Design a protein around this ligand. Sequence first.
Ligand code: NA
Length: 137
Amino acid sequence: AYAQWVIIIIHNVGSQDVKIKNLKASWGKLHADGDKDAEVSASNYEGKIVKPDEKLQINASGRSDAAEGTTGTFDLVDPADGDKQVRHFYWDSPWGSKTNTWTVSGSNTKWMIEYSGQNLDSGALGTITVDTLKKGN
Ligand code: NA
């Protein structure tokens, strides 16, 4: 029963560009770094490239005065391979004592993806770092 939020940090730790697509919060809203009430457009991120050694930070929060959590999805795609999907991502940080969800799905064996930081218990889902590396087949 507290304010729900997530921060997703995509860190490209490989040598090949990765691209974000289809970023959509189904509950709550995307917001600016360090201000959970300052809504931003998904077009700030849609189609953006994360270059080698760069980070891209996405922040989402619920409507904390309406007992609302935040839920959303995005894809990473490979801009050198026709925007082939790398992985699909899903977050859910429901309001209350409810368990959170952070799911990475899909397959693309040219890429390795590692994540950590998620809080799956009660409370906000929190800060999740996603490391991306194109390893080839
Ligand atoms: Na929660």
